[PDB]
Structure 1
Amino acid sequence: ADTLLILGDSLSAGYRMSASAAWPALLNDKWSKTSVVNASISGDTSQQGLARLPALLKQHQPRWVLVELGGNDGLRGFQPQQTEQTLRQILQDVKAANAEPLLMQIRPPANYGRRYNEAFSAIYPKLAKEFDVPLLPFFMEEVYLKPQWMQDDGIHPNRDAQPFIADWMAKQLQPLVN
């Protein structure tokens, strides 16, 4: 089976829950045909993900790499321009490893400021166009509509949400991984 590497933060690693409870594990279970390797770490900024990428590509030799990063950059002092360059590098590295990067749109909280939010959000469509890659919608948009799937911080999806995110992701990824 080919390998799909998930390079994400808390949203893919699972916030305050075990690896087996996070949606990537459920997806892996749902899929013998495709191996889903979760290389996500709670709190990771795009830079921290990029730092771990080289070893991951060499060790896992993935055919596809889902990039779900950037949400932690704002609070970590990174300007939209820095997030853009970091993601650009990640996409470059993924392609150079003969893997297909699958980028996911990320949306920061509204209390971050319109100036930042507009610039930040624009990063994703720009890179997807620049590298001609798939741009998946932010999976949390659907989760936000179900308070019963949100943890207390109003930021991370809870345990009950994972199976649904896994199904949602399976649907989005199906066409991309054949």
Structure 2
Amino acid sequence: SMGESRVILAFGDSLFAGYGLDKGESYPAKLETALRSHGINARIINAGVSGDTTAAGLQRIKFVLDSQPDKPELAIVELGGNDLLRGLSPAEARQNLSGILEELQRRKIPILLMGMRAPPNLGAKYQREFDGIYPYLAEKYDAKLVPFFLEAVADRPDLIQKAHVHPTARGVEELVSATSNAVAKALPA
């Protein structure tokens, strides 16, 4: 094929950084290779930062864009999962994401928004509120939306790394039942 590669900014968190994976296994790296089959030679900027909240992304979006030798021709924005994990305000996540999209729009960079979904442990009120910020933002900023970025691994625990283990409340009781004998015996009489 003729010509320089198309530049795509992958702006996200651990899901773009490739946390826990080897060289070239991250989503941006594998997406770059897959686009060849769509007739596209891309150079995907991996701007994934593990642990980034929406506020962290807002804090660095201008710096990341100003650091580019080639202006992105598409920006993929994948943030909010860490706000979820921390139980942070969905309204503030929406505000922070708005600031990121406003900067991209200011520079006339097309946007693809990766939709994030809350797990049920936050409760239905929180989950509905969080989930709704992504279609709202995509409409407001004329961005394309992948409604559920992680949909393809949603029912595939065999495709997810064994990482953090946060017992449920019932899981805690399980651990207490298994370890209280050891604690009682370690406590001097």
Same fold (TM over 0.5): yes
Shorter chain as denominator, the TM-score bin is 0.7 to 0.9
Q: C-alpha distance in 2, partners of 1:111/1:3? A: 38
1:57 aligns with 2:65: yes
Rg comparison, structure with higher value? 2
Q: Map of 1:102-113 to 2, 5 A cutoff?
A: 102-113=112-123
Cα-Cα RMSD: 1.9
What residue ranges of structure 2 are gaps of 5+ in the alignment?
Answer: 166-189
Given the alignment, which residue of 10, 15, 19 partners 1:11? 15
- Counterpart position of 1:34: 42
- Counterpart position of 1:66: 76
Q: C-alpha distance in 2, partners of 1:19/1:82? A: 34
Q: C-alpha distance in 2, partners of 1:4/1:96? A: 17
1:88 aligns with 2:98: yes
The structure whose RCO (Cα within 8 Å, separation 6+) is larger is 1
What residue ranges of structure 1 are gaps of 5+ in the alignment?
Answer: 156-178
Percent identity between matched residues is: 39
Quote how far apart the aligned CAs of 1:103 are: 0.7
Given the alignment, which residue of 121, 125, 129 partners 1:119? 129
Q: TM-score scaled to structure 1, two decimals?
A: 0.79
1:98 aligns with 2:108: yes
Cα 1:144–1:74, aligned 2, differ >3 Å: closer, same or farther?
Answer: closer
- Counterpart position of 1:22: 26
Structure 1 counterpart of 2:66, one-letter code: K
Cα 1:19–1:13, aligned 2, differ >3 Å: closer, same or farther?
Answer: farther
Q: TM-score scaled to structure 2, two decimals?
A: 0.75
